[PDB]
Structure 1
């Protein structure tokens, strides 16, 4: 499903939780903060 462009929600906004097109990964503000906070290990990248 795709969210409509216009955020007419009776004043209840959701931007922070909504995905961000600007970010390379269309993630929520909050979820970006979570990923930043986690000191993740075993990144599982291709390496070499």
Structure 2
């Protein structure tokens, strides 16, 4: 991830967790309770 200094780590999916979601998508699923 050499994008010239830009850090899309909060939006790109996280492989070191299950369901393969980004940090922000994780908090979007944990903050909406069915």
Tell me if TM exceeds 0.5.
Answer: yes
Query: Unaligned stretches of 5+ in structure 2?
Result: none
Please report the TM-score for the alignment, with normalisation by the length of structure 1.
0.66
Q: Which has the higher helix share?
A: 2
Highest relative contact order (Cα 8 Å, sep 6+), 1 or 2? 2
Q: Take 2:29 and 2:14, find their aligned partners in 1: how far apart are those partners?
A: 14
Query: Unaligned stretches of 5+ in structure 1?
Result: 1-6, 41-48
Cα RMSD (Å):
0.6
> What is the deviation of 1:39?
0.7
Please report the TM-score for the alignment, with normalisation by the length of structure 2.
0.87
> What is the deviation of 1:34?
0.3
